[PDB]
Amino acid sequence: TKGILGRKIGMTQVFGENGELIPVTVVEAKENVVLQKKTVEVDGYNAIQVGFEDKKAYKKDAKSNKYANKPAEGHAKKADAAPKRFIREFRNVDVDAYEVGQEVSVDTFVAGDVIDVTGVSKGKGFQGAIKRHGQSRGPMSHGSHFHRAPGSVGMASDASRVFKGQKMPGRMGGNTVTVQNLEVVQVDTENKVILVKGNVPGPKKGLVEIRTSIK
Amino acid sequence: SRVGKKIIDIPSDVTVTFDGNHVTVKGPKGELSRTLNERMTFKQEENTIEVVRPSDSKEDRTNHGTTRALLNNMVQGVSQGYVKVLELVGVGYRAQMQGKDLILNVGYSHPVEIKAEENITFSVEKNTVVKVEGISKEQVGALASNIRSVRPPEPYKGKGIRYQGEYVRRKEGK
Amino acid sequence: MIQQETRLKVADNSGAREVLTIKVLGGSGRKTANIGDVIVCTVKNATPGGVVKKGDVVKAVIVRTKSGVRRNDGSYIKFDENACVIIRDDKGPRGTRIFGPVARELREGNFMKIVSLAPEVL
């Protein structure tokens, strides 16, 4: 049900209804090819594999991730295509169609269709307790020695240990988050880009998979 | 102990045949229904099933009055077929039918719909009222009762739809 | 952004000159309020003559604040002071005159009687 993979480019704004201002996120979805599919007889569930950007050659003197390896190259030769960089699975779409080896599209979604965006977060690293969580700080005057720090972490003799999940200082980092109820304002087929009304998680030039509002 | 030798007839448009733990009433009156009547020692000799199973167990005297009546209500309501009337207390019930989906109204901004099942006939001589039929009171009954209790009739001032006739607790205030 | 303990300049002819908001009615937890909101305040400075006296608890709708008010077209509008009009608990002004301009957000707040005396309506 309209499954594709894109890459966050930046952000901007456009005008639509009479004179309303709507901020959008420029997503760039280029060459998208479908790989091997999974059936309920062999695998055990219905799902289709899809690649993204292509790489160079393989089996040479490369040491970076720019070139592919025998394993990947060999698995990409079965679909009669080039080695991809990003690979994901869509078990929410139909497996009856999407002939293996054939590419996807970019005009599959029509302006006004509800979609769901998914991706990793930015990342801040080791954070505090009033930053990672919504905790408040203590007084800064009246001879106080308690500022940006956590308070009590348990009772007294009731329990001689700390309960699991006490919201202690840690590393925020970036976990995979999904945003629902997202609409498509426009869809360009010349530059193969999609305009989503709102903001998606992740930094610049980052992976971002789109789907269809399951509701 | 309660009702021991109350061996009554089975003069039917039907017959009874016993193999399992039950009966089955095939008759032009009502064609081929039954549940499992009784895991008691059930006989049916020349016309009827009045089988002297239970005695000397406290459970047995309610088992008698229950399972002679599982057989009894089944065979009769599937032979006889008897649902009585319901009431029309007020102004402005919109009584009708749409197959197996009737209609009324109570004074809701939105008449909410109710639909029923078959094997309990949807019988409508009803213009602001209810009066239905079917075969087995076990299956016309709970529906003769979902229809009882739509807007529980004004226990002060008259409006509602209800059963064949009683008194309601009629209350007064300022 | 009009929170608790804030002095505003009433732009009416009732008899008040300055009031101090006591509570921003609107819900449990409400802190601030923008143009098109009702707040409960008290007269801190009045004038010899009128119906409202000093030390009276009355209601009023804040109109034209220092903070901006974003629209739907992407345009903003901010004044150089924070004013307000005293109501009569019926979406109606206690006075009959209004000084200074007003915003066009009172029309959506069912205040057609307050946007019929204001000289300008930006």
Place this chain on the structure above:
Amino acid sequence: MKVRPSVKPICEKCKVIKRKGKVMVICENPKHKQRQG
């Protein structure tokens, strides 16, 4: 209904039968009616 431990057949119209845990009473008037508490 009412709820007190001392249920009985209350007036000269209410009479009792055992239910699951309640030995409550059935009759013609909702001013004499009780279930064990």
Place this chain on the structure above:
RNA sequence: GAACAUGGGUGAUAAGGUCCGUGUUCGAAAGGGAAACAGCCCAGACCACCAGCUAAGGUCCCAAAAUAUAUGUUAAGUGGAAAAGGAUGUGGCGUUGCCACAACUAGAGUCGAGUGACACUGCGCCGAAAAUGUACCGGGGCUAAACAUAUUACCGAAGC
């Protein structure tokens, strides 16, 4: 000096309270049973053994020995935690009496088969609300692997 069982005072026929009297155990006592538990039940270790018989308590699995036999009682998981009361609960003990009592009705006539107060009971039922987590059968689990009797068999200590 302490608890347990009895006989009293004092306090509130309150306290793991406090003071006397008569016993036993701990103190100064290991071993077996009470899930773990100085004071409760059985019993007093001189040393060796890959011998045998018993005590309290026990015999479906954890975990040694009956998924033993005969008879009743119990439908709550009662067993496996409280009381005044309450009642168409009941297996046993005595009544009382219509040959009607379930659909009769005064606020009168039938048909077909059990009705009840009262009295002593035995086992149940409701009365029954607490703070980290099932949460007193020790756990899995049991309609007998529960209770009241009888007779047996066998297991069981550093006792003989």
Place this chain on the structure above:
RNA sequence: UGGCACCUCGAUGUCGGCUCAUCGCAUCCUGGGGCUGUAGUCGGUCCCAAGGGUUGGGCUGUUCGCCCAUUAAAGCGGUACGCGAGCUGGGUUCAGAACGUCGUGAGACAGUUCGGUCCCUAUCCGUCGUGGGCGUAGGAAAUUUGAGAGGAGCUGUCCU
């Protein structure tokens, strides 16, 4: 509020408030009801229901308590009267003073009032993050099934 004196005097070191919680039901709000001396809105007593909510100020140090203005509501409790090797030091509660009653006097009463040093580099368990080693009957790379575990859950007004 008390009674008893069983653990701690080679130290179990502090009442409110701040910060952050978690559990209960004897239910403040929301919900599902029979019943009202419930027509309707409303509201009174009872039954079931513990998921999530449960406001900012003025006044003495107040755990209390009255008042102002709101809110769907501003419930009652347990957790060393939760939490000082997380904070404050106002209240108690040390050496200086003043008044009042009492004492021959040194003083006492806590009756009031003003001023008065809050120490510690985290070994073990616990909790919040993040790596190294080996295991899975050949070795390696990439995409995955989900037995389990956590998070979420509230509510108002207008057009009709």
Place this chain on the structure above:
RNA sequence: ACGGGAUAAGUGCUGAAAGCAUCUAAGCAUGAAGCCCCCCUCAAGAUGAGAUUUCCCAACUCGGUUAUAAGAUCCCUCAA
């Protein structure tokens, strides 16, 4: 803020102890912000170590020592 599967106080139906009558002795449809499912994140150290596609393959002699192959790193220029 939705949609299911059960249920608790109530509500009637089948139908009784004790012949008439109770929602219980067997069954029954209803039935709540509660409980399972559905939404989102982590999940085979789930030693019960799962599954799918692709890549790699030996001389000694099988004391296994020597070894290479797919791949992985050390080292260097860097930041989503």
